[PDB]
Amino acid sequence: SEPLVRFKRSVNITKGDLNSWRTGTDPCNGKWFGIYCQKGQTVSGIHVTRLGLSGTINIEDLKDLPNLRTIRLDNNLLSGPLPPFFKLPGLKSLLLSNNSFSGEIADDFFKETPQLKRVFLDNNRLSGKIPASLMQLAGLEELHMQGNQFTGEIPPLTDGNKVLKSLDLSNNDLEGEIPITISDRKNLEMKFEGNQRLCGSPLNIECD
Ligand SMILES: *[C@@H]1O[C@H](CO)[C@@H](O[C@@H]2O[C@H](CO)[C@@H](O)[C@H](O)[C@H]2NC(C)=O)[C@H](O)[C@H]1NC(C)=O
Ligand SMILES: *[C@@H]1O[C@H](CO)[C@@H](O)[C@H](O)[C@H]1NC(C)=O
């Protein structure tokens, strides 16, 4: 569990240090900063933030951690397309706040990620239509996508979801009627401000 983690460290970091993720030491000894471990034995989360990570994530390295469940890479400089996080089958928490990931996410990106409870993609530069499969996750509880450049209509949310309690789509450029699959729910903190073109809604604008 040491060599793949330091494959992942060896991309591009511009602010701060390892320090350290030594290749010949166990990452659950308690010295490895920013690592979480199930039961003091195996790696289950990566939590590294504000290091100016400017390189590229190679998810084949992260696939060699079989019980990794949480990734939190908030406030770095990661850019390019969104890496294929769907290749990690047990992933529960994907936190990539304030990075610079760009481009359109494949609509089928979340077809085979039923374990995801939390997806924070806010304040990147993602574009082009929220993937419909994201809104088909029955177990998605927290989805924060504010501050991107998403366009098009919001996909409907499946009735199979009974746990979504926080949805933030503010400050994008979304268009259609806000789906009543979302707005009817009485336990859902939802946010849609700063989305001109958007109507229906908890917002006070018809639609039409
Ligand atoms: C994403 O970036 C913003 C900008 O820094 C963070 O929001 C600010 O957070 C500071 C705390 O350091 C607050 O004092 C400001 O009021 C916040 N400003 C705004 C406009 O929200 C935000 O927390 C970052 N997201 C994460 C997860 O760290
Ligand atoms: C990583 O850094 C090296 C030099 O430090 C550079 O050649 C390479 O292009 C960088 N890659 C990314 C994705 O920033």
Residue numbers in the entry: 26 to 233
Sentences from the paper on this structure:
Plant receptor-like kinases (RLKs) play key roles in various biological processes involving plant immune defense and development. PRK3 is a type I transmembrane receptor which contains an N-terminal signal peptide domain (SP), an LRR capping domain (CD), a leucine rich repeat domain (LRR), an LRR C-terminal domain (CT), a transmembrane domain (TM), and an intracellular kinase domain (KD). It has been revealed that the AtPRK3 has a vital role in pollen tube growth, plant fertility, and plant reproduction.
To gain a better understanding of PRK3-mediated pollen tube development, we have crystallized a protein fragment of PRK3 spanning residues 20–237 in space group P42 with two PRK3 protein molecules in each asymmetric unit. The AtPRK3 ectodomain contains six copies of plant specific LRR repeats ranging from 23–25 amino acid residues. The ectodomain forms a single continuous structure in an arc shaped conformation. Two N-glycosylation sites are identified on residues N37 and N123, with only one visible GlcNAc sugar residue conjugated on N37 and two such residues on N123. We believe that the exposed N123 glycosylation pattern on the concave side of the PRK3 ectodomain can form hydrated branches and are likely to facilitate the association with other molecules. Our size-exclusion chromatographic analysis of the recombinant PRK3 protein further supports the hypothesis that ecdPRK3 remains a monomer in solution.
